[PDB]
Structure formats: C-alpha cells, structure tokens
RNA sequence: UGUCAACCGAGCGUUGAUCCGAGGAUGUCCGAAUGGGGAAACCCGGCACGAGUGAUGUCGUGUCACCAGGCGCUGAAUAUAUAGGCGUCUGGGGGGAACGCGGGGAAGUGAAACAUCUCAGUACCCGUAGGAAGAGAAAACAAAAUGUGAUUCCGUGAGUAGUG
RNA sequence: UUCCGGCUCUACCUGGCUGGAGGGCAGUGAGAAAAUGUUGUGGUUAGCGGAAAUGGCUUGGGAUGGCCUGCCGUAGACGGUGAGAGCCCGGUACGUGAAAACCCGACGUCUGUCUUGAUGGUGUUCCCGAGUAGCAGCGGGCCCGUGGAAUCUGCUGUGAAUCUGCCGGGACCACCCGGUAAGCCUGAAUACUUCCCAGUGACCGAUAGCGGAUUAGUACCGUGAGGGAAUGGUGAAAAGUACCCCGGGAGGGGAGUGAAAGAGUACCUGAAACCGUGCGCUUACAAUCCGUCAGAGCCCUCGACGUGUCGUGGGGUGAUGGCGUGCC
RNA sequence: CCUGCAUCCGGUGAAGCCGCCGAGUGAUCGAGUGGUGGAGGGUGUGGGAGUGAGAAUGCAGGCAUGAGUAGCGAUUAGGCAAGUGAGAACCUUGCCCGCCGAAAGACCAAGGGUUCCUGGGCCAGGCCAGUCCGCCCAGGGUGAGUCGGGACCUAAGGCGAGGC
C-alpha cells in the first residue's frame, strides 16, 4: 500500500491535521491504520470505573508518508540490477525510503 | 489464524507467512450400484496375500454382477451336427436448460348450435445421437430461348393462381 | 517418354501375367490406415510499471463547497475517501509480462496407388443395382376436403424388360425435349445457452423488483402428486451513556459522549384512521340526512382614536328565525 | 416521472411534512413568509409515459363499536398451623376432611423423541399472580453368550436371469 509500520506520516485532512506521528498498526482489509497522538477519543472503561483517552483507526486516503527531510512526498520504486528487490523512491528527491 | 457476530485463550512470520495460477494423493457411506442381502446412507460372506493370540474369536490390501460381440475347448435325446456348457479379451446399463431426426398422439374453443373442418400435427409420450443436425451430385425445371446445372437458408414472387 | 528376374504346362523366337531397383504423386485427408524423430512476443490461464496542488483566502465538526492562482493530459471512464475531486487512494490511455499447460498454425522419419504402362479408331458376341418398376384394392400429406386425379409414400394380391431399354413434360394417344432409380460417404452458407469472461439500460428501488436484498424453495399445510409465506436504512468511528440517585427488575432522573440523544440497538426522515392532558366558547323543556343565509353575547387579534369606540378590519364560538328527502 | 438541449439555485440549508398570509374563470399556485429535517433541485423548449380512485360482497398492512359484556373447557370439595420470599387461597412441611379403586393404580407392543436427574432465573407460554412447570439455560444420564430382533426356517404376497 506504499505504506508500512514503523514509518513516519504526516495528516493532511480532518481534525489534527498538521500535526505529525508514528504509525503503530496497519489493516489492509479495511485500507485504514492507527497513529498514535492523532484522534484522540475518551472512553468509559468500568470494571472500577473511569474515562481513558485511546485512537481510532484513520483511513490511510487521508494520510501519507513523509520524507526524511521533514517534507511530505509521495512513493515511487525502482528495479536493482543486483538482487532485484523492489525498493521505495522519494518521487521528489529520489532517495530512498 | 474464511464467514454469520462480538469474546477469551493460544501462535506463526525476512530462513518469504496469507493469496492467487497450473499439475499431482488421499477421497467414509448411499446413489446406474455390480461379493450376497435390504425400509438411502445398514446387515452378512467366499478367495488370495499380510498383521496379532498357546489356538478360535480379530484386523489391513486386492478380487468375487448381468447382457451383447469376437477367440479357444467341449458336442446331449442322436448318428452326422445343433442347442447347451466352460475359459479368456472387447464394449453397454445413469445424468444433463435449449437446439434436431422418425413415429404415436388428444379435448376447451369459431362457425352466435353442430357431425365435416379449425384449433393442430399444438401439449405430451416414445427410440434416438451431435455440437450442430438432416439433406445432397438430377430418372430437376422450363418451352422451341442454341435456356439454366448438387444441397441448404433468407427477401420477393401474393394473400394472387386455387381450395372449402 | 528406365533396368533385371520368375512365369503364360514345359526348352527355343514372336504377343501377355508377376516380383526387385531411378522419377514424379499425395498423406491425417471423404477418396487407406499406423506411428516416430526439430517453430509463432501465436493468444490464454496470474501479475508489474505508469504522469500533475500538503496552493492562498473564506464557511465550516469535517472541504470533496464559493473567490483567486498553477500543472498533466497517448491518462477529464468508473468507484472509495468525514459534504459534487483530472493532479488523496484504487486505476483508467499506454506499455510490459509466464514455471507449467492448452490449442491452433510452419519446419522434419515414416505410409501407400501408379510408371507390366499411357495416346487417338473398326465389326462383331455379353453388362449397366428384384419380388423392384407397373397394374388392382384400401389410407396418408402435397392448395387438390375422392373429386378426371398427376407425384411421394404405408399394407395386401398380381407382376415386367436391358440402349430402336426404361421413366418423365397434372388423364390419355402421336410427334418433339430432358434424364439414366431401385447401394454408400461428403466440410461452407443455418438453429440454441444449463456454464465462464468482458460490457450496456430515456428498465424496478423493499406491497415494485425472479417466489427468494434476511434462516429459501426454509418454516408451514397436505400421509400424495403438490402448494407456498412476512421480516434493509443509528452515527464517522460504539465513543452502545462511566459515575450518583428512585427502585426487584423492567424502567427513569442528573452528570458526561458526541452536531444533534427532537440519533439511545424498540435506534433517518414520522401522515391518517386511533387514544390523550391543558386552555377558550356553548348545552339539562328538546323532535335535527346534522348544512347554509341572517343573527345577540363572549373571547383573540391589526390599525386610528384613549379608560373603551369605530374601521373600504380580520378570526373562534355560536343563543334565536327562514330554507332544506345521502353517493354509485 | 424519465430524458436531449441552454440556463440558475443549494451545509449562509436542496427534497416531504405542519401552519400563516395571500393569488387564478378549473383541474390549483406562491423565486412570500414560520417549526422539522439533512443532500440534491427549478425555470424555458422538444421526445417517451406502468401518468391522476369512492364503490367491483377487491387484495397487503394498521386501527374502530359488541366490551371491559360472555366465558375462564363438568358430572368430587377443600380447610387449618408453620416455612420460603417483596408479593402466596393455587409453592414446601405437618394435621383433619372427601374421591377413585375392573381404576382416576402397576405394566407391555405400536406410537414422540430428550419430556429423565442435577443445578439458574422468571420480559415469551400456563385462560388470573406465580417462589412452580410437560418454559427455557448448562451439565449428566441409557452396561445382556441366557429379555425382544439379526446371524435359524417358512405364508398371503412382491422381484425376476432365461422365456412368451
Ligand atoms: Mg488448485
Ligand atoms: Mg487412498
Ligand atoms: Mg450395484
Ligand atoms: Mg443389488
Ligand atoms: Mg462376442
Ligand atoms: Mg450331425
Ligand atoms: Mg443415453
Ligand atoms: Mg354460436
Ligand atoms: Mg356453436
Ligand atoms: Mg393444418
Ligand atoms: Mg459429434
Ligand atoms: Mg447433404
Ligand atoms: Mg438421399
Ligand atoms: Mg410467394
Ligand atoms: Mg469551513
Ligand atoms: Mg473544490
Ligand atoms: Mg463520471
Ligand atoms: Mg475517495
Ligand atoms: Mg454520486
Ligand atoms: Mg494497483
Ligand atoms: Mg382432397
Ligand atoms: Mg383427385
Ligand atoms: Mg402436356
Ligand atoms: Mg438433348
Ligand atoms: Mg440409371
Ligand atoms: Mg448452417
Ligand atoms: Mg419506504
Ligand atoms: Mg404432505
Ligand atoms: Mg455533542
Ligand atoms: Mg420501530
Ligand atoms: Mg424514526
Ligand atoms: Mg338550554
Ligand atoms: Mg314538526
Ligand atoms: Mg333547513
Ligand atoms: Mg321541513
Ligand atoms: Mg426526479
Ligand atoms: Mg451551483
Ligand atoms: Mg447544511
Ligand atoms: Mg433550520
Ligand atoms: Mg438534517
Ligand atoms: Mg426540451
Ligand atoms: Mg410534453
Ligand atoms: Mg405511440
Ligand atoms: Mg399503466
Ligand atoms: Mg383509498
Ligand atoms: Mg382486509
Ligand atoms: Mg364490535
Ligand atoms: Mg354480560
Ligand atoms: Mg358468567
Ligand atoms: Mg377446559
Ligand atoms: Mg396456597
Ligand atoms: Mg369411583
Ligand atoms: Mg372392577
Ligand atoms: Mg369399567
Ligand atoms: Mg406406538
Ligand atoms: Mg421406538
Ligand atoms: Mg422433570
Ligand atoms: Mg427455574
Ligand atoms: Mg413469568
Ligand atoms: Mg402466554
Ligand atoms: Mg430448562
Ligand atoms: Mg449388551
Ligand atoms: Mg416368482
Ligand atoms: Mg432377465
């Protein structure tokens, strides 16, 4: 999906947008994933009762992964002559990712 | 780590999971059912080779219909010979929405009734194969033109020549 | 328009029969059939690459809304993404691309007739598809519904000829004209979809649409053939209301979630029959297909004028008089 | 209502619904205004309609009166003390009374399949309330050389290799 774990992703669209996070979980059925410190949501856990703040999954069409420049660029790939390995592309650096 | 539909506990994966493409094995029982039996999915055996017990009782893998056509042997009352009887190979028993071929084959209804007719060679049934089928190489038309030249399928030829 | 041999009883010359070797002929073929040795980016069964705005200002819960600036276009078909997206995502134009297998086509051992044979003439003796053709009786379908009844055909009797032979031109005779049945194969033009792949709708949107958007030919009914049902929309995510209180629960009130809780799993939008609570007017001496035309009082209201009184004023109620025989 | 064409409106609130105020000679109209809602609509000119309800003893769904009226499904009949629990004439214990007793009792085959026991509760059902249940939940429960059948034999009848 041009989208992995462990990678760095910025918002574009919805509530917090502007603001950058860490990516936790991915879901390919559902084309969504989870970031951490992006929709931040209140819910009553009761066992012991209390309120909890946790994140709902965002759907990835509105969020994408940025460079490692601190700038937001898309994900291109290239073929190695060597092994073959398909690897991701800044499209507007050309660096590897 | 499919799904109805959350939830728990358990785990794998960079040494390539999951997925999809092609081929390959296993495939309980019934179901043309074909070792024998029978109320579908339940009862009972023969033979050969193996496994187990001091021996029976037990268990695994094979094989054990019928019909027709070839091939070989045999030849009754009865003599020539046949029928019949044995051994061995080759084929068939059912299913499928529509499409074809050859037969059988109905009644409602119109005629303001109704026997002839029409409904109709329709519905249905029977025996049949295929991916298509059937038909097919003039004992054919026409009429004085020195004409066409296997078969099949469409449009006209006309709702006319006829028939009731 | 090749060579040799053995045969036409036999050995020798003449004329014929049959085998072994060039050179052509075709071959999966209806004209004969079986197998065995080397090519197409031919397509198909998966995939992969694939261009351009985090643009500014605004309403906003959310921009994929409005105004102004850019870029790609062999890609502004189509869907998803928190509200109508060419430049966010899935992909579309275009390019590529397969281990194995499929089928088609082309390139290669092998099979077999003929060259013992072909070409143009002549008079004589034999052949050209048997219970068939035709004839007589009884039935079919051709427009022909036995009528004069041609042709084809089913059954029963009788029963013919081989080239100056035979059958056909709607009876039939004569003359002309066409043809050679009584044995067998033959692709192309045509008919259809239980299945699979790709596409379309001035066709339907939950009493419509296939009987079937969900437990579907299920439940259910009938011992049988068989008949044959109704049941979608919370929201962006469940964040499905912690906690406190009344209470057995069911159920409810605060406080929070969220845009809304006039969204609380009985959850979009919520009409009419139907049942209500509160408010205003009226009725207990009355003979009404239940309305209309007049019509005092009371109440609500809009203006100008003041305590309430008029006005090219509106509304609800109606005490009381006249009129008055539902619809198809 | 759906459509070709040219236009305008719309999260600063589009479609229905409920009012007020008005308007046309009709089937009606309002780009005039108020509440509910949240996602597509109007005008102009052409083309196509499953295009207009009150009645067929019509059909699918919902709801009126009779009505809080009749009944609450026999020929025996209950009463008392105590207990459980929020609730008891209908549940548990104890004591009186009555009834059946060729059955209103104890069993077989046919007939149903979990109604049997233990433990849980009482929004569905029991013609009323239910702590109870032939309600449901979860678990457990069915022991044959000698009992009934098969491996033993046969009838009225069915199948039928050959065959007619
Ligand atoms: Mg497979
Ligand atoms: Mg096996
Ligand atoms: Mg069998
Ligand atoms: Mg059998
Ligand atoms: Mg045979
Ligand atoms: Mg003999
Ligand atoms: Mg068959
Ligand atoms: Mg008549
Ligand atoms: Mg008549
Ligand atoms: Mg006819
Ligand atoms: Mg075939
Ligand atoms: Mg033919
Ligand atoms: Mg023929
Ligand atoms: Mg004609
Ligand atoms: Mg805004
Ligand atoms: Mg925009
Ligand atoms: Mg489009
Ligand atoms: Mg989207
Ligand atoms: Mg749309
Ligand atoms: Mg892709
Ligand atoms: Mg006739
Ligand atoms: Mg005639
Ligand atoms: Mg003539
Ligand atoms: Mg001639
Ligand atoms: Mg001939
Ligand atoms: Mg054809
Ligand atoms: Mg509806
Ligand atoms: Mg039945
Ligand atoms: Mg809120
Ligand atoms: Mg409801
Ligand atoms: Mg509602
Ligand atoms: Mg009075
Ligand atoms: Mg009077
Ligand atoms: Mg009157
Ligand atoms: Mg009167
Ligand atoms: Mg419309
Ligand atoms: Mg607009
Ligand atoms: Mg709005
Ligand atoms: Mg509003
Ligand atoms: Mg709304
Ligand atoms: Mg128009
Ligand atoms: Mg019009
Ligand atoms: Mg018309
Ligand atoms: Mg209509
Ligand atoms: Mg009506
Ligand atoms: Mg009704
Ligand atoms: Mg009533
Ligand atoms: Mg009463
Ligand atoms: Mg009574
Ligand atoms: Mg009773
Ligand atoms: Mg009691
Ligand atoms: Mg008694
Ligand atoms: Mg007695
Ligand atoms: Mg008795
Ligand atoms: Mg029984
Ligand atoms: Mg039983
Ligand atoms: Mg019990
Ligand atoms: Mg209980
Ligand atoms: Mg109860
Ligand atoms: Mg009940
Ligand atoms: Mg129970
Ligand atoms: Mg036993
Ligand atoms: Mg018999
Ligand atoms: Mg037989």
């Known amino acids: 999906m041009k989208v992995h774990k462990g990678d760095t992703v910025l ?3 919805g509530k917090d ?8 979980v991915a879901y390919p059925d559902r084309n969504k ?3 951490e410190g992006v929709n931040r949501i209140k819910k009553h856990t009761a066992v012991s009762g209390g309120i909890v703040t946790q994140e709902a999954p965002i759907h ?3 969020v994408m992964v940025v460079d490692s420049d601190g700038k937001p660029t898309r994900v291109g790939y290239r073929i190695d002559d060597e092994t073959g390995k398909k690897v991701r592309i ?3 650096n050309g660096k590897d990712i």
């Open 90 to 92: 800044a499209k507007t």
């Open 60 to 62: 990835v069409s509105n």
């Open 33 to 35: 994933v989870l970031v």
């Open 17 to 24: 947008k502007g603001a950058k996070g860490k990516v936790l």
């Open 11 to 13: 918002v574009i669209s």
